Short mmCIF file of C-alpha atoms in Angstrom, two decimals:
data_model
loop_
_atom_site.label_atom_id
_atom_site.label_comp_id
_atom_site.label_asym_id
_atom_site.label_seq_id
_atom_site.Cartn_x
_atom_site.Cartn_y
_atom_site.Cartn_z
CA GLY A 290 23.98 -0.22 25.05
CA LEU A 291 21.25 -0.68 27.48
CA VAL A 292 18.00 -1.84 25.88
CA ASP A 293 18.21 -4.49 23.04
CA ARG A 294 18.87 -2.77 20.16
CA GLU A 295 19.71 -6.28 17.69
CA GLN A 296 15.40 -7.03 18.75
CA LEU A 297 14.58 -3.41 16.76
CA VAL A 298 17.16 -4.54 13.86
CA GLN A 299 15.26 -7.63 13.42
CA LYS A 300 11.07 -5.92 14.28
CA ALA A 301 12.48 -3.83 11.24
CA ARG A 302 13.68 -6.51 9.05
CA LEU A 303 10.31 -8.28 9.92
CA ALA A 304 7.78 -5.41 8.94
CA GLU A 305 10.40 -4.71 5.42
CA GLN A 306 8.70 -8.12 4.59
CA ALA A 307 5.54 -7.05 5.41
CA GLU A 308 5.35 -3.86 3.58
CA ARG A 309 4.64 -2.26 7.14
CA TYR A 310 6.88 0.89 6.37
CA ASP A 311 4.74 2.70 9.61
CA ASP A 312 6.26 -0.08 12.07
CA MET A 313 9.10 -0.65 10.07
CA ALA A 314 10.45 3.27 10.51
CA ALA A 315 9.44 3.43 14.14
CA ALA A 316 11.69 0.85 14.65
CA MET A 317 14.45 1.87 13.12
CA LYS A 318 13.99 5.47 14.76
CA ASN A 319 14.31 3.56 18.29
CA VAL A 320 17.59 1.72 16.49
CA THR A 321 19.18 5.44 15.71
CA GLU A 322 17.83 7.09 18.85
CA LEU A 323 20.34 4.80 20.62
CA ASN A 324 22.91 6.63 19.23
CA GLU A 325 25.22 4.44 17.96
CA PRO A 326 26.85 4.28 14.24
CA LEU A 327 24.15 2.09 11.79
CA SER A 328 25.70 0.04 9.60
CA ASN A 329 25.56 -0.56 5.79
CA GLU A 330 21.98 -2.28 6.23
CA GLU A 331 21.28 -0.53 9.14
CA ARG A 332 21.34 2.78 7.11
CA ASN A 333 19.69 1.16 4.43
CA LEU A 334 16.57 -0.04 6.67
CA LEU A 335 15.94 3.43 7.82
CA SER A 336 16.28 4.67 4.08
CA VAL A 337 14.06 2.24 3.12
CA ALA A 338 11.69 2.71 5.74
CA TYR A 339 11.21 6.48 5.85
CA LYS A 340 11.37 6.58 1.76
CA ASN A 341 8.52 4.42 1.60
CA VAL A 342 6.54 5.84 4.12
CA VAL A 343 6.97 9.39 2.83
CA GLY A 344 6.51 7.84 -0.75
CA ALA A 345 2.82 6.82 -0.09
CA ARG A 346 2.21 10.46 0.56
CA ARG A 347 3.64 11.98 -2.41
CA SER A 348 1.67 9.66 -4.61
CA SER A 349 -1.56 10.25 -3.01
CA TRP A 350 -0.23 13.98 -3.26
CA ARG A 351 0.09 13.86 -6.67
CA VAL A 352 -3.22 12.28 -7.46
CA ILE A 353 -5.10 15.02 -5.51
CA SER A 354 -2.79 17.88 -6.90
CA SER A 355 -3.36 17.00 -10.43
CA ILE A 356 -7.65 16.45 -9.49
CA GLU A 357 -7.43 20.26 -8.09
CA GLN A 358 -6.36 21.14 -11.51
CA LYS A 359 -9.44 20.09 -13.64
CA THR A 360 -11.78 20.41 -10.41
CA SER A 361 -11.17 24.07 -9.87
CA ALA A 362 -11.90 24.77 -13.50
CA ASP A 363 -15.33 23.58 -13.26
CA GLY A 364 -16.02 26.02 -10.22
CA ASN A 365 -17.82 23.45 -7.53
CA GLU A 366 -17.66 25.56 -4.43
CA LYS A 367 -18.36 22.25 -1.99
CA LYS A 368 -15.61 20.10 -3.88
CA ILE A 369 -12.84 22.40 -4.57
CA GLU A 370 -12.88 23.02 -0.38
CA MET A 371 -13.23 19.56 -0.05
CA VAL A 372 -10.28 18.84 -2.47
CA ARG A 373 -8.47 21.39 -0.69
CA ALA A 374 -8.56 20.05 2.74
CA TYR A 375 -8.60 17.18 1.49
CA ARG A 376 -4.87 17.90 -0.51
CA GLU A 377 -3.72 19.91 3.01
CA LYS A 378 -4.36 16.54 5.24
CA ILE A 379 -1.94 14.95 3.17
CA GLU A 380 0.36 17.91 3.07
CA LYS A 381 1.08 18.04 6.68
CA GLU A 382 1.08 13.60 6.70
CA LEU A 383 4.27 14.44 4.51
CA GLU A 384 5.77 17.11 6.35
CA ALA A 385 5.32 15.35 9.72
CA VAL A 386 7.32 12.34 8.02
CA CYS A 387 9.83 14.82 6.44
CA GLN A 388 10.36 16.51 9.92
CA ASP A 389 10.54 13.51 11.60
CA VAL A 390 13.57 11.94 9.61
CA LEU A 391 15.22 15.25 9.01
CA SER A 392 15.62 15.43 12.76
CA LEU A 393 16.87 12.19 13.13
CA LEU A 394 19.82 13.00 10.21
CA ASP A 395 20.29 16.40 12.09
CA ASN A 396 20.54 15.74 15.76
CA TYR A 397 21.89 11.59 15.35
CA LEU A 398 23.53 10.47 12.13
CA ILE A 399 24.99 13.55 10.45
CA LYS A 400 26.21 14.68 14.31
CA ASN A 401 27.82 11.66 14.82
CA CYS A 402 30.05 10.78 11.60
CA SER A 403 33.22 11.55 12.51
CA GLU A 404 35.35 13.46 10.07
CA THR A 405 36.43 10.62 7.93
CA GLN A 406 33.36 8.73 8.01
CA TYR A 407 32.87 10.07 4.46
CA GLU A 408 30.49 7.31 2.54
CA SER A 409 28.44 7.78 5.66
CA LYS A 410 28.32 11.60 5.70
CA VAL A 411 27.27 11.41 1.85
CA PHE A 412 24.55 9.18 2.28
CA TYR A 413 23.10 11.32 5.37
CA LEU A 414 23.29 14.71 3.82
CA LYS A 415 21.57 13.36 0.16
CA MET A 416 18.73 12.07 2.30
CA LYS A 417 18.51 15.31 4.12
CA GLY A 418 19.07 16.76 0.36
CA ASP A 419 15.90 14.29 -0.49
CA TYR A 420 13.68 14.96 2.36
CA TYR A 421 14.05 19.03 1.76
CA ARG A 422 13.10 18.18 -1.86
CA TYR A 423 10.11 16.47 -0.90
CA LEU A 424 9.22 19.19 1.59
CA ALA A 425 10.04 21.72 -1.58
CA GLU A 426 7.31 19.64 -4.50
CA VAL A 427 4.13 20.77 -1.95
CA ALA A 428 5.55 24.19 -0.37
CA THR A 429 4.69 27.79 -1.62
CA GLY A 430 5.90 31.11 -1.35
CA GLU A 431 8.78 31.75 1.40
CA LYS A 432 8.01 28.60 2.91
CA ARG A 433 9.31 26.97 -0.55
CA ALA A 434 12.34 28.95 -1.14
CA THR A 435 13.63 28.26 2.08
CA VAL A 436 13.77 24.36 1.79
CA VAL A 437 14.72 24.77 -1.85
CA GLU A 438 17.81 26.47 -0.19
CA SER A 439 17.91 23.62 2.60
CA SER A 440 18.08 21.07 -0.11
CA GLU A 441 20.42 22.69 -1.71
CA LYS A 442 23.13 23.02 0.64
CA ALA A 443 22.61 19.80 2.01
CA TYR A 444 22.99 18.42 -1.59
CA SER A 445 25.96 20.65 -2.53
CA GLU A 446 28.16 19.89 0.36
CA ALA A 447 27.17 15.98 -0.30
CA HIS A 448 28.79 16.56 -3.49
CA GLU A 449 31.83 18.47 -2.84
CA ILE A 450 32.60 15.30 0.10
CA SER A 451 31.94 12.99 -2.57
CA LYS A 452 33.90 14.14 -5.25
CA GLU A 453 37.17 14.26 -3.22
CA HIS A 454 36.91 11.28 -1.26
CA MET A 455 34.27 8.86 -3.09
CA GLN A 456 35.37 7.01 -6.90
CA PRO A 457 32.80 8.13 -9.31
CA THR A 458 31.53 4.73 -9.92
CA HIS A 459 30.60 4.57 -6.24
CA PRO A 460 26.50 3.67 -5.84
CA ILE A 461 26.18 6.49 -3.53
CA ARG A 462 27.94 9.49 -5.19
CA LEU A 463 26.18 8.14 -8.34
CA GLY A 464 23.15 8.15 -6.66
CA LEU A 465 23.29 11.72 -5.19
CA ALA A 466 24.46 12.75 -8.89
CA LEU A 467 20.95 11.31 -9.81
CA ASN A 468 19.00 13.14 -7.45
CA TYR A 469 20.84 16.23 -6.95
CA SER A 470 20.45 16.45 -11.22
CA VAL A 471 16.53 15.73 -10.20
CA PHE A 472 16.32 18.56 -7.53
CA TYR A 473 17.79 21.09 -10.42
CA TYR A 474 15.54 19.68 -12.98
CA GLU A 475 12.26 19.80 -11.19
CA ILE A 476 12.43 21.91 -8.46
CA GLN A 477 15.12 24.97 -9.37
CA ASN A 478 13.96 24.76 -13.09
CA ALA A 479 17.12 24.92 -14.08
CA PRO A 480 17.40 21.94 -16.90
CA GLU A 481 20.73 23.07 -18.54
CA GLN A 482 22.63 21.98 -15.12
CA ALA A 483 20.28 19.17 -14.58
CA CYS A 484 21.92 18.23 -17.50
CA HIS A 485 25.45 19.07 -17.00
CA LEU A 486 25.94 17.32 -13.68
CA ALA A 487 23.94 14.16 -14.87
CA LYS A 488 26.46 14.58 -17.73
CA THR A 489 29.36 14.80 -15.73
CA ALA A 490 29.10 12.14 -13.29
CA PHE A 491 27.87 9.65 -15.99
CA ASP A 492 31.03 10.31 -17.82
CA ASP A 493 32.86 10.06 -14.86
CA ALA A 494 32.20 6.59 -14.28
CA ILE A 495 32.85 5.67 -17.41
CA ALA A 496 35.80 6.20 -17.61
CA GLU A 497 36.56 4.15 -14.67
CA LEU A 498 34.10 1.53 -15.51
CA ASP A 499 37.31 -0.32 -17.14
CA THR A 500 38.43 -1.86 -13.92
CA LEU A 501 35.32 -2.40 -11.99
CA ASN A 502 34.50 -5.92 -10.06
CA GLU A 503 32.22 -7.89 -11.25
CA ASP A 504 29.96 -7.12 -7.92
CA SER A 505 29.88 -3.47 -8.24
CA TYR A 506 29.24 -3.68 -11.60
CA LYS A 507 25.83 -4.58 -11.79
CA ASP A 508 25.11 -1.60 -8.69
CA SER A 509 27.07 0.94 -11.07
CA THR A 510 25.26 0.53 -14.11
CA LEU A 511 21.62 0.20 -13.05
CA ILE A 512 22.27 3.64 -11.50
CA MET A 513 23.91 4.97 -14.32
CA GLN A 514 20.79 3.68 -16.74
CA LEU A 515 18.79 5.80 -14.95
CA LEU A 516 21.07 9.02 -15.00
CA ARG A 517 21.30 8.13 -18.55
CA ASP A 518 17.53 7.36 -19.21
CA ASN A 519 16.53 10.90 -17.22
CA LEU A 520 19.35 12.40 -19.74
CA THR A 521 17.89 11.18 -22.70
CA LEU A 522 14.59 12.13 -21.68
CA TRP A 523 15.72 16.23 -21.15
CA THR A 524 17.50 16.54 -24.27
CA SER A 525 14.10 15.81 -26.37
CA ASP A 526 12.15 19.20 -26.96
CA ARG B 140 8.98 13.66 -15.67
CA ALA B 141 12.21 12.57 -13.74
CA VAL B 142 13.58 9.36 -12.10
CA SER B 143 14.93 9.38 -8.77
CA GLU B 144 16.82 6.13 -6.59
CA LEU B 145 15.53 2.46 -6.24
CA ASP B 146 15.07 1.87 -2.92
CA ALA C 187 -12.69 25.10 6.82
CA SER C 188 -10.15 21.97 6.84
CA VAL C 189 -12.09 18.55 6.00
CA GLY C 190 -14.28 19.03 9.32
CA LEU C 191 -16.92 18.74 6.16
CA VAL C 192 -19.93 16.15 7.09
CA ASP C 193 -22.61 16.50 4.79
CA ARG C 194 -23.77 13.67 2.60
CA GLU C 195 -22.75 14.52 -0.67
CA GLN C 196 -19.71 15.87 0.66
CA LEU C 197 -18.64 12.64 2.39
CA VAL C 198 -19.06 9.97 -0.96
CA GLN C 199 -17.12 12.73 -2.37
CA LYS C 200 -14.57 11.93 -0.18
CA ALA C 201 -14.31 8.43 -0.45
CA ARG C 202 -13.96 8.98 -3.84
CA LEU C 203 -10.85 11.10 -3.35
CA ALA C 204 -9.86 9.16 -0.48
CA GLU C 205 -10.21 5.95 -3.15
CA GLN C 206 -8.15 7.96 -6.13
CA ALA C 207 -5.14 8.47 -3.40
CA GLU C 208 -5.81 4.71 -2.11
CA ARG C 209 -6.06 5.81 1.33
CA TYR C 210 -8.52 3.35 2.26
CA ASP C 211 -8.47 3.64 5.85
CA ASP C 212 -9.98 7.39 5.01
CA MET C 213 -12.06 6.25 2.43
CA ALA C 214 -13.28 3.35 5.13
CA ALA C 215 -14.15 6.10 7.54
CA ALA C 216 -15.86 8.48 5.35
CA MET C 217 -18.34 5.30 3.75
CA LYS C 218 -19.12 4.53 7.56
CA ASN C 219 -19.72 7.82 8.17
CA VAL C 220 -22.67 7.66 4.88
CA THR C 221 -23.68 4.38 6.32
CA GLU C 222 -24.35 5.36 9.88
CA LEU C 223 -26.69 8.63 8.34
CA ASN C 224 -29.34 5.40 8.26
CA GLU C 225 -29.85 5.93 4.52
CA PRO C 226 -30.02 3.15 1.61
CA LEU C 227 -26.33 3.13 -0.23
CA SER C 228 -27.07 3.64 -4.04
CA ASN C 229 -24.96 0.79 -6.16
CA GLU C 230 -21.81 3.09 -6.29
CA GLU C 231 -22.15 3.79 -2.91
CA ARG C 232 -22.19 0.20 -1.93
CA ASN C 233 -19.05 -0.68 -3.56
CA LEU C 234 -16.97 2.32 -2.10
CA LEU C 235 -17.74 0.59 1.34
CA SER C 236 -16.65 -2.65 0.15
CA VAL C 237 -13.75 -1.33 -1.59
CA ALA C 238 -12.71 0.62 1.31
CA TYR C 239 -12.91 -2.28 3.76
CA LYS C 240 -12.10 -4.76 1.60
CA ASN C 241 -8.69 -3.34 1.04
CA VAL C 242 -8.11 -2.15 5.08
CA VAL C 243 -8.64 -5.90 5.77
CA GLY C 244 -6.15 -7.11 2.71
CA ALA C 245 -3.76 -5.14 3.60
CA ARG C 246 -3.73 -7.16 6.95
CA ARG C 247 -4.51 -10.40 6.24
CA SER C 248 -1.92 -10.23 3.59
CA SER C 249 0.37 -8.91 6.63
CA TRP C 250 -0.71 -11.27 8.82
CA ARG C 251 -0.05 -14.58 5.99
CA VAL C 252 3.73 -13.38 5.58
CA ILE C 253 4.54 -12.97 8.99
CA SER C 254 2.31 -16.39 10.04
CA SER C 255 4.75 -18.45 7.11
CA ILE C 256 7.89 -16.46 9.08
CA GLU C 257 6.44 -18.08 12.02
CA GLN C 258 6.48 -21.76 11.10
CA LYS C 259 10.18 -22.15 9.68
CA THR C 260 10.99 -19.91 12.74
CA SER C 261 9.70 -22.42 15.34
CA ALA C 262 11.34 -25.23 13.92
CA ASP C 263 14.84 -23.22 14.74
CA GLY C 264 13.74 -23.02 18.25
CA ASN C 265 15.02 -19.12 19.35
CA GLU C 266 12.80 -18.07 22.37
CA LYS C 267 13.65 -14.91 21.61
CA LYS C 268 12.34 -14.47 18.15
CA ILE C 269 9.79 -16.91 18.25
CA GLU C 270 8.45 -14.63 21.18
CA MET C 271 8.98 -11.43 19.05
CA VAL C 272 7.14 -13.12 16.11
CA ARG C 273 4.18 -14.23 17.58
CA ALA C 274 3.64 -11.23 19.84
CA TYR C 275 3.76 -8.81 16.18
CA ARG C 276 1.66 -11.92 14.85
CA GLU C 277 -1.32 -11.06 17.32
CA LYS C 278 -0.78 -7.26 16.54
CA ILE C 279 -1.99 -7.62 13.47
CA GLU C 280 -4.57 -10.08 14.31
CA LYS C 281 -6.02 -7.54 16.82
CA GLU C 282 -6.18 -5.10 13.96
CA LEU C 283 -7.65 -7.16 11.58
CA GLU C 284 -10.24 -8.38 13.95
CA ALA C 285 -11.49 -5.07 14.73
CA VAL C 286 -11.93 -4.13 11.44
CA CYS C 287 -14.09 -7.31 10.92
CA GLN C 288 -16.14 -6.08 13.71
CA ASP C 289 -16.13 -2.50 12.63
CA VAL C 290 -17.92 -4.02 9.09
CA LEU C 291 -19.80 -6.75 10.20
CA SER C 292 -21.53 -4.39 12.96
CA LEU C 293 -22.46 -2.00 9.88
CA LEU C 294 -23.81 -4.71 8.24
CA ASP C 295 -26.00 -5.99 10.82
CA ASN C 296 -27.01 -2.66 12.75
CA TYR C 297 -27.75 -0.72 9.34
CA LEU C 298 -27.81 -2.43 5.97
CA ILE C 299 -29.13 -5.52 6.32
CA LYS C 300 -31.74 -4.59 8.72
CA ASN C 301 -32.83 -1.63 6.85
CA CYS C 302 -33.24 -3.50 3.77
CA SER C 303 -36.84 -4.23 2.79
CA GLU C 304 -38.14 -7.69 2.01
CA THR C 305 -38.00 -7.03 -1.97
CA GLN C 306 -34.68 -5.54 -2.05
CA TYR C 307 -32.92 -8.54 -2.60
CA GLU C 308 -30.16 -7.72 -4.48
CA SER C 309 -29.13 -5.71 -1.67
CA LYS C 310 -29.96 -7.84 0.79
CA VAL C 311 -27.42 -10.83 -1.02
CA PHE C 312 -24.43 -7.79 -1.83
CA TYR C 313 -24.44 -7.72 2.47
CA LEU C 314 -25.22 -11.11 3.25
CA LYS C 315 -22.21 -12.37 1.06
CA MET C 316 -19.81 -9.60 2.43
CA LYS C 317 -20.31 -10.48 6.13
CA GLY C 318 -20.02 -14.26 4.70
CA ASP C 319 -16.59 -13.21 3.63
CA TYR C 320 -15.75 -10.91 6.89
CA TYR C 321 -16.49 -14.04 9.12
CA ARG C 322 -13.93 -16.01 6.69
CA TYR C 323 -11.77 -13.54 6.90
CA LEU C 324 -11.98 -13.76 10.74
CA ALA C 325 -12.02 -17.91 10.44
CA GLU C 326 -8.35 -17.55 8.43
CA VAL C 327 -6.86 -16.26 11.50
CA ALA C 328 -9.38 -18.27 14.56
CA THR C 329 -8.34 -21.52 16.37
CA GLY C 330 -10.59 -23.62 18.66
CA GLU C 331 -13.80 -22.82 19.71
CA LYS C 332 -13.50 -18.88 18.10
CA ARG C 333 -12.86 -20.37 14.90
CA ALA C 334 -15.80 -22.72 15.05
CA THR C 335 -18.16 -20.06 15.89
CA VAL C 336 -17.57 -17.70 13.19
CA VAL C 337 -17.08 -20.40 10.73
CA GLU C 338 -20.92 -21.31 11.61
CA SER C 339 -21.14 -17.31 11.44
CA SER C 340 -19.76 -17.30 7.63
CA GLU C 341 -22.11 -20.29 6.87
CA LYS C 342 -25.21 -18.75 7.94
CA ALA C 343 -24.56 -15.34 6.04
CA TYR C 344 -23.40 -17.06 2.48
CA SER C 345 -26.11 -19.75 2.77
CA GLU C 346 -28.94 -17.52 3.39
CA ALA C 347 -27.14 -15.55 0.23
CA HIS C 348 -27.62 -18.71 -1.56
CA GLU C 349 -31.02 -19.04 -0.98
CA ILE C 350 -32.22 -15.55 -1.93
CA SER C 351 -30.14 -14.89 -4.88
CA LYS C 352 -31.15 -18.94 -6.57
CA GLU C 353 -34.99 -17.62 -6.33
CA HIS C 354 -35.13 -13.78 -7.53
CA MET C 355 -31.42 -13.04 -9.31
CA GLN C 356 -30.37 -14.88 -12.38
CA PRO C 357 -27.27 -16.95 -12.89
CA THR C 358 -25.15 -14.86 -14.97
CA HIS C 359 -25.49 -11.80 -12.53
CA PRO C 360 -22.15 -10.56 -11.42
CA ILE C 361 -23.04 -10.43 -7.40
CA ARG C 362 -24.45 -14.04 -7.50
CA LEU C 363 -21.51 -15.25 -9.65
CA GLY C 364 -19.11 -13.93 -6.94
CA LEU C 365 -21.50 -14.96 -4.01
CA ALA C 366 -21.00 -18.56 -5.58
CA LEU C 367 -17.10 -17.96 -6.32
CA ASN C 368 -16.74 -16.74 -2.66
CA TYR C 369 -19.06 -19.39 -1.14
CA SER C 370 -17.11 -21.92 -3.03
CA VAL C 371 -13.54 -20.56 -1.47
CA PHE C 372 -15.24 -20.56 1.66
CA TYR C 373 -16.04 -24.12 0.91
CA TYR C 374 -12.58 -25.27 -0.19
CA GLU C 375 -10.14 -23.01 2.21
CA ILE C 376 -12.11 -22.90 6.02
CA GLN C 377 -14.35 -26.25 5.63
CA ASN C 378 -11.87 -28.24 4.07
CA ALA C 379 -14.24 -29.68 1.91
CA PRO C 380 -12.89 -30.08 -1.98
CA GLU C 381 -16.15 -31.97 -3.64
CA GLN C 382 -18.62 -29.34 -2.26
CA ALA C 383 -16.48 -26.53 -3.27
CA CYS C 384 -15.94 -27.83 -6.88
CA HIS C 385 -19.87 -29.01 -7.26
CA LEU C 386 -20.86 -25.16 -6.05
CA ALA C 387 -18.53 -23.45 -8.43
CA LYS C 388 -19.17 -25.81 -11.21
CA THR C 389 -23.11 -25.63 -11.27
CA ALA C 390 -23.01 -21.95 -10.70
CA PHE C 391 -20.83 -21.80 -13.89
CA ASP C 392 -22.78 -23.97 -15.80
CA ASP C 393 -25.97 -22.32 -14.89
CA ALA C 394 -24.60 -18.83 -16.11
CA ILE C 395 -23.27 -20.69 -19.61
CA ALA C 396 -26.86 -21.76 -20.15
CA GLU C 397 -28.45 -18.03 -19.89
CA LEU C 398 -25.39 -16.46 -21.71
CA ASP C 399 -26.41 -16.87 -24.92
CA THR C 400 -28.36 -13.68 -24.22
CA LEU C 401 -26.30 -11.44 -22.72
CA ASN C 402 -26.24 -7.61 -23.16
CA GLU C 403 -22.88 -6.83 -24.50
CA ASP C 404 -22.42 -4.55 -21.03
CA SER C 405 -23.16 -7.38 -18.77
CA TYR C 406 -21.46 -9.98 -20.51
CA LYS C 407 -17.91 -8.26 -19.85
CA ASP C 408 -18.84 -8.24 -16.20
CA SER C 409 -19.92 -11.57 -15.95
CA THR C 410 -17.24 -13.81 -17.89
CA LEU C 411 -14.73 -12.17 -15.68
CA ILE C 412 -16.03 -13.46 -12.78
CA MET C 413 -16.95 -16.80 -14.27
CA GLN C 414 -12.88 -17.24 -15.72
CA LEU C 415 -12.13 -17.26 -12.06
CA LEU C 416 -14.84 -19.87 -10.94
CA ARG C 417 -13.08 -21.89 -14.05
CA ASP C 418 -9.57 -20.95 -12.90
CA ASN C 419 -10.55 -22.29 -9.08
CA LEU C 420 -12.20 -25.76 -10.52
CA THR C 421 -9.09 -26.35 -12.78
CA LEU C 422 -6.79 -25.74 -10.10
CA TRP C 423 -8.97 -28.05 -7.72
CA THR C 424 -9.36 -30.76 -9.68
CA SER C 425 -5.59 -30.69 -11.01
CA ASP C 426 -4.34 -32.34 -7.88
CA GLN C 427 -7.40 -34.94 -7.06
CA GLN C 428 -6.84 -38.61 -6.41
CA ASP C 429 -3.35 -39.31 -7.67
CA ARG D 255 -1.06 -22.35 -4.37
CA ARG D 256 -4.98 -20.72 -3.88
CA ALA D 257 -7.94 -20.82 -5.10
CA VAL D 258 -9.21 -16.83 -5.82
CA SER D 259 -11.96 -14.57 -4.52
CA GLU D 260 -13.41 -11.55 -5.67
CA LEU D 261 -11.65 -9.31 -7.75
CA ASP D 262 -11.68 -5.34 -7.36
CA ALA D 263 -8.80 -3.33 -8.77
#
């Protein structure tokens, strides 16, 4: 506690409202680097900043990846090169953001979790799975295989921990199930696992839905919808 | 295509 | 190869790509490069430039507004540490916003407007309106003598574009309407002169309506779009007159 | 509320 932490979180909050996620991420990275635990709010400000920063690049990457595929069919060298290069440019930005977060997760956030801070360990492991997943979206060959494995390990470990020490309605445990299911469908290409996981997690939540507070009831159903929407979409051919 | 978190 | 790809067609192609990726910084840099080759810009190319820089500066206007507004509820609560922080961050955004504005304005003065031949009225008007827009954007964030100077600079550009468009362009042309639209807004928001704002918007709308009879079905969609905005503004500006 | 200047997207 030797530089002013509250100011940094306050800058993060400002930047968020100004939709300036690069600034936001840089503030929360600084907060993280002070090496103390993050509050629930602070966790989310980090999560949100980097999700938006990498998301802008995922969105770009997809638009360009798709242009590259109709373009290559027309066979223009100059244009095929140009598009390939620009896609690469975006890739390198995306990956650099991904390491940035992953490094914070490995070397600060996860590291400094005590054995019984199960909620935090799960949040951060899910996040680690997410960001390796985002690398997998744009990787190919041996590189892809490696980050896919890294994603699985993080999503899997978060699953074990969340199964035992968190209840099935908890937003984080649902969010994990949601993203892990999506990992299965989109990266592993394993629809039956995707669905089983989403279904299981949905059903387990419904069981406990009886005695949910009215506060947490809004939080859980929001995510449970998305599980269902996906399942509906996946079970349709 | 599928959907992930809303944050 | 790796995006050190520099010839003119390539650059415009990068601009198009960047635009679809919503990477306006990249887009602006490409079109700046195209401009610096010192040849005229096609209609498409003009718009790519216009669009890139409009989006780049528009992100900073939008940020600047959210923070300026936070600075005003914040100063009422009297916290030094927060008042300073906000002030500093607003400044940071300002300097970015102004830098972009000079970048464009420099291209306009030293390439685009300069290389207009006397009878390229359409281009000279586009570019002068643009020049008025960007000096206007500076005025939004300026104060004191600095503000007065850029407000004058905006008026000169918007005014010259007006003369040229009045004589050599028809009243339904999207560019002449867009100019009227933005020049009217300049009057209302920067000069704080509602009666001129309205007159100009109204005059330009009425003049367009007169010629609306014999508009192609192609240009009919282009002009009405802008004419709506003229009207919307007018309605808004005259729904809080002396009450 | 404000007035609207020339649009784009």
